Ligand binder design. Structure first.
Ligand code: A1L52
Ligand code: A1L52
Ligand code: CL
Ligand code: CL
Ligand code: CL
Ligand code: CL
Ligand code: CL
Lengths: 173, 173, 173, 173, 173
């Protein structure tokens, strides 16, 4: 409320609510990816666990945004959450490509919100994103690119063999 | 590569590579300073250890820049490393003055890169420098100024005595 | 200085300084190899760690030479450090071949310095090299040859698969 | 005796006995230096302890030579031990200069014996000296030069003050 | 000697000495196999360790036979030990086939000695072989057959890949 709100624009408040939607959508996408890889006809446990972990990380991101919204005196507003873009996610390669596309979209939304904060002279917002989101996103995208490269190297002329080996020797934990 | 690169300009990529060169040059300068103070005709162990520690710190700085370059999708490019500016470093006072000059040069390069990042709207770069370099540099320059002042107070009319006492009671560990 | 210098020729002093340059050049080469393998489009962690460890080992070698130079009363003299021979290092096989070529060059330089020491009747120098460098180099070259052979056996008709398996089952730690 | 003696020349046997004499003479010199610094009118405990420790180290050196003589089948032969060159040793500076002169003399004797062993193709003798004497001597001479330099820096225009400070802050343990 | 010898035929005594020769020959064969796999151009550590362990096991077998010979009052007689049948041992498959051939030969020699003992009514000899040799040999031959089958399954159309995988996932310890 207005009792604590200071230097917190309506534009930033709304963009924060939009970003919560994007993180919860991303969490939902990762839930769908994770359970696809748990199908008996897909059966790649390491890939399932990778994406289920990302579902939790994205929910945590939304939670942190909602805590900050209240710390600043803004009001959380929730919208409908769109279902994921696919019901079936193809190979590990297809899935990891979809995830990197998703992560770049979230990263661009973080950068856009940082730029709005900078324009509005809101350094608390800018520090919040830098401290809890920007480097986390850069680290995750780098990890996913490393994975993509290893998955791509393993396709060669024996795709099933490569897909099994990647799950067993890189992801399974 | 382009598979992960996002909001990372060619200008920042090149300046990062330049800054790696400056840190490795600084590491090399500190290696030369450290071993000069280990000469049998100089023999100031605390001063030697001070500069050898700084050689390692500057290498670590270069390492962190190289990790970040890859996290962002840029490409490390290495250049020849210039030898240090002196083969003999004079007194502890002369050496500490040279080190503060070196550190101010690195600090200015950090500030210049921060300003480029700000101009290019690259908040990850700006946060990286603020979080791992700017305050570390400020702390080190303050330490070195404190040392300079103590060394200068000890010169008086008995320079050898002062140089021994500083090494024994401030630096030796 | 002359206050401690005994049985230490100008020829050995200069060759020691040259060898410090070669070790620091080798360290720099291994830094470049290590970070190449950390690229998102290469992504072979075990190979990166192998070469980063070698960067540190070669720096340690230079450090030991510089300590001995001072123990003997010689004077360390530093020269410019040439950049590595390549900016991109190809496959793990290409890189391991380059490393063995580098190591044989360092080994020949050690042998040449040993021979100079023997000719100058400098047994301290000869023992120093035998005790801290010759067997270390032989052990490392044997390791690298073992690696080369395993990498070569894995190329067959599925190079990407072999390169992944070598990194995962031999190098990753 | 001849029952075990193999590749052990009469020349090396005699030079070993001569070297035992030199080490025991050096031990005796250090005993005299140590007790001089324990005089009530000299009273520099750290300097006394430094030289008493060196008396023990030199005796240990003689002991090791005598063990090796018997291991090789040679026969220990003892000669009269000359008294030290001085009854009073002057300042800490005078004493440290005398000690470095003594150590260089022992080092030259080690080098001469190494050269005889090399000429006689006696690698056990050569390794023995390299492993237990040459580097120990180099390390000690470097230490003594470092001390000389610090003592010399402290003389300035207040010699008593410098002599006290060196004993208290470098040697006293 | 005759002071303890009881129910111990000259035929069994001689066959025991022959069997010691066969075990020491087998130990020597396994030493050669082990070091072949340690060559830089073969480089299969698990295979090397497998055969070096077998060298020790076969020596232990000879030792046990020699202890028993003396327990029974027979006299150990040693003969020349023939060098192994090959200087180079080919692939892991070739080597494992040679080892199974060697083990079947030792097993037949054990069975022949058991039969001689049975014919001579020497139950101590028969129990000795049953208790310390027959089942050990059966277990080892079964292990080696299991290995052969796995090596053979891995040849397919990528022999190098299979040879690496067997060493890494079955033998390396
Ligand atoms: C002279 C410029 N160069 C050559 C590129 C240096 C200088 C200093 C270095 N210091 C280290 C170092 C220091 C402490 C602990 C670990 C390490 C290490 O693993 C690698 C190093 O590499 C170095 C290279
Ligand atoms: C032959 C006459 N000389 C030379 C003056 C000896 C003889 C025996 C010595 N034994 C020791 C000794 C023995 C045990 C533990 C410590 C020490 C030591 O610190 C110094 C010694 O100094 C010696 C000199
Ligand atoms: Cl939808
Ligand atoms: Cl230059
Ligand atoms: Cl160059
Ligand atoms: Cl005399
Ligand atoms: Cl034969």
């Amino acid at each position: 409320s207005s009792q604590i709100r200071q230097n917190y624009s309506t534009e930033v408040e709304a963009a924060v609510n939009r970003l919560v939607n994007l993180y919860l959508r991303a969490s939902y996408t990762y839930l769908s990816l994770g359970f696809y890889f748990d199908r008996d006809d897909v059966a790649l446990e390491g890939v399932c666990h990778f994406f289920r972990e990302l579902a939790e990380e994205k929910f945590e991101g939304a939670e942190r945004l909602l805590k900050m919204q209240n710390q600043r005196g803004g009001r959380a507003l929730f919208q409908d959450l769109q279902k994921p873009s696919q019901d079936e996610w193809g190979t590990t390669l297809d899935a990891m490509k979809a995830a990197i596309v998703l992560e770049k979209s979230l990263n661009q939304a973080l950068l856009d919100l940082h730029a709005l904060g900078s324009a509005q002279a809101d350094p608390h917002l800018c520090d919040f994103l830098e401290s809890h989101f920007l480097d986390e996103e850069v680290k995750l995208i780098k990890k996913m690119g490393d994975h993509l490269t290893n998955i791509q190297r393993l396709v060669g002329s024996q795709a099933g063999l490569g897909e099994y080996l990647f799950e067993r020797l890189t992801l399974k934990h």
